[PDB]
């Protein structure tokens, strides 16, 4: 039943004042992208930075199994868009946040699926 909880350990480390994982690979891009969370190519908007996904994955970086039966990674081989205010800790951002399964935007950082109904626009 024993299972190493790397996610919780990194969050406790950060809460204690630990230095965030570094050398996440930031990409050059136009910053005129869709703003979606995880994409096949950099899609940062004006308020985000795009990073190589593998470099922002706690499991890839710590050389630990991915927390799922198949051991599949949703970041490796893709690009993750991180809000500029959180670009100092992309690993911590991907762990603490969830991608909306409907619009593909981060919950609380792009997803507008839960906003009051807009009046219809011509």
């Amino acid at each position: 039943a024993f299972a190493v909880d790397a996610a919780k350990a990194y969050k406790d480390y950060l809460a204690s004042g630990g230095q965030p994982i570094t050398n996440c690979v930031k990409m050059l891009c136009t910053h005129t992208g869709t703003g979606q969370a995880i994409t096949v190519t950099p899609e940062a908007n004006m308020d985000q930075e795009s990073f190589g996904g593998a470099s922002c994955c706690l499991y890839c970086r710590c050389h630990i199994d991915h927390p799922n039966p198949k051991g599949f990674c949703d970041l490796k081989g893709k690009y993750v868009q991180i809000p500029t205010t959180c670009a100092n800790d992309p690993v911590g951002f991907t762990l603490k946040n969830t991608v909306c399964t409907v619009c593909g935007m981060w919950k609380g950082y792009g997803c507008s699926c839960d906003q009051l109904r807009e009046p219809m626009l011509q």
């Binding site: 050398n23 996440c24 690979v25 990409m27 593998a54 890839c60 970086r61 081989g77 690009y79």
Partner: peptide, 28 residues
């Protein structure tokens, strides 16, 4: 311990391209 050049090649190359990389030392 990361692959900056590989991340750029994967951004540059068409999404359907197969990309294999290699190095003497382990890296993500």
């Amino acid at each position: 311990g990361v692959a900056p050049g590989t991340a750029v090649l994967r951004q540059w190359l068409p999404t359907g391209t197969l990309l294999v990389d290699s190095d003497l030392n382990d890296f993500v």
